[PDB]
Amino acid sequence: GSHMYLSKQLCFLFYVSSKEIIKKYTNYLKEYDLTYTGYIVLMAIENDEKLNIKKLGERVFLDSGTLTPLLKKLEKKDYVVRTLQISLTEQGKAIKSPLAEISVKVFNEFNISEREASDIINNLRNFVSKN
Amino acid sequence: GSHMYLSKQLCFLFYVSSKEIIKKYTNYLKEYDLTYTGYIVLMAIENDEKLNIKKLGERVFLDSGTLTPLLKKLEKKDYVVRTREERNLQISLTEQGKAIKSPLAEISVKVFNEFNISEREASDIINNLRNFVS
């Protein structure tokens, strides 16, 4: 058994891990005037993809309540185009390259080896697989 | 695996893992009018522990900017008590805060059982995450 104990540890560690990751991203994203979730949205929208807000909200796990305002924000900064069909603008498709360099930096700060990273990846792929 | 590819997979998998976990917690926490972060604070505060608000911010990785407004809400529901024992702000669980933590703990078990990973896989994840958080 001990599911109570394992559960508590998973609870804690997933919570702490996301907080530490997010915090480090916030630092790098400030220079682009973007939040963690806005960054996630921009990377989750493949270049030249015409998605409807509902489908986007399913991919990035965001309810319309937070998504709608987020899209408005990315609307003015002019990174996405709300015609509801959503897509990346030209300057929007642009930043996806330098933003793509930021995750490498954030995850290096945790200073884990390539093997450890690969093991974590394999564990999470399994944990999430069946949702 | 280049660091770019690995970082990308970590980015995605941590984001999704976290989101799938929150979702489930939110669904079961609604009937208590508690948010996932509210639940985290409640569980972070030990019963009979008159904790300093900043010591709390450290273990819960929240800044007082967001920690303060939340403590106020939990205080309204009579689960927590803010006492100025004497220039600092102390935080403690009420009798009701202690009681509710019983059913709240069962939720965390329901949440994770739903992912259906084995005890061994769970230990692997914990071990890998302990190291990651170092």
What DSSP assignment string belongs to chain B? --HHHHHHHHHHHHHHHHHHHHHHHHHHHGGGT--HHHHHHHHHSPTT--EEHHHHHHHTT--HHHHHHHHHHHHHTTSEEEE----S-EEEE-HHHHHHHHHHHHHHHHHHHTT---HHHHHHHHHHHHHHH-
Tokens 């559960």 label which residue? A7
Return the closest-CA partner of residue A29 out of A17, A43, A16.
A43
Tokens (6 digits) for B126: 């914990």
Count other C-beta atoms under 10 Å from residue B109's C-beta.
16
- Which domain range does residue B70 map to? 1-134
- Nearest alpha-carbon partner for A103 in A41, A24, A50: A24
The rounded Cα A71 to chain-centroid distance in angstroms is 15
User: Is the dihedral angle over the CA atoms A83, A49, A121, B131 positive or is it negative?
Assistant: negative
Type of residue at B83:
T
Tokens for A28, please give them: 């790098």
User: What torsion, rounded to 10 degrees, do the Cα atoms A48, A49, A53, A59 define?
Assistant: -120
Look at A104 and B1 and tell me if their CB atoms are within 8 Å. no
**Resolution as reported, in Å:** 2.3
Half-sphere exposure of B115 (CA within 13 A, CB side): 32
Closest-CA residue to B130 (of A20, A37, A100): A20
Method: X-ray
Give chain B positions within 8 Å (CB) of A100: 4, 8
Contact call for B121 and A117, based on CB within 8 A: no
Block residue for tokens 């893992």 = B17
Element (H, E) at A86: strand A85-86
The SS3 of residue A98 is helix
Please give, rounded to a whole number of angstroms, the shortest distance from the CA of A13 to a CA of chain B.
6
Contact A16, B133 (CB under 8 A): yes
Beta carbons of B90 and B55 less than 8 angstroms apart: no
- Contact between A114 and B4 (Cβ < 8 Å): no
Q: Do residues B109 and B72 make contact, with C-beta atoms less than 8 angstroms apart?
A: no
b/e map of B34-68 (b: 16 or more CB within 10 Å)? bbebbbbbbbbbeeeeebebeebbeebbbeeeebe
Task: Tell me if B61 and A23 make a contact (CB, 8 A cut-off).
Answer: yes
C-alpha torsion A3→A5→A8→A14, nearest 10: -80
CB < 8 Å to B118, chain A? none
What's the token pair of residue A15? 């919570």
DSSP state of A80: B
Question: Which residues touch B61 (CB under 8 Å, ≥6 apart)?
Answer: A15, A16, A19, A20, A23
3 state SS of A58: helix
The C-alpha atoms of residue B50 and residue A59 are separated, in whole angstroms, by 42
Entry field: residues in chain A: 131
Rounded CA separation A82/A76 (Å): 11
Nearest in space to A45 (alpha carbons), one of A71, A21, A76: A71
- As to burial, measured by CB atoms within 10 angstroms (0-12 exposed, 13-18 middle, 19+ buried), residue A88 is buried
What b/e readout covers A59-79, taking b as 16+ CB neighbours within 10 angstroms? Answer: ebbbeeeebeebbebbeebeb
Residue B32's CATH number: 1.10.10.10
- Tokens at A103, concatenated: 């995750």
- For chain B, the domain total comes to 1
Residue A86: phi and psi, rounded to 5, are -120, 145
* Gap between the Cα atoms of B11 and B7, Å rounded: 6
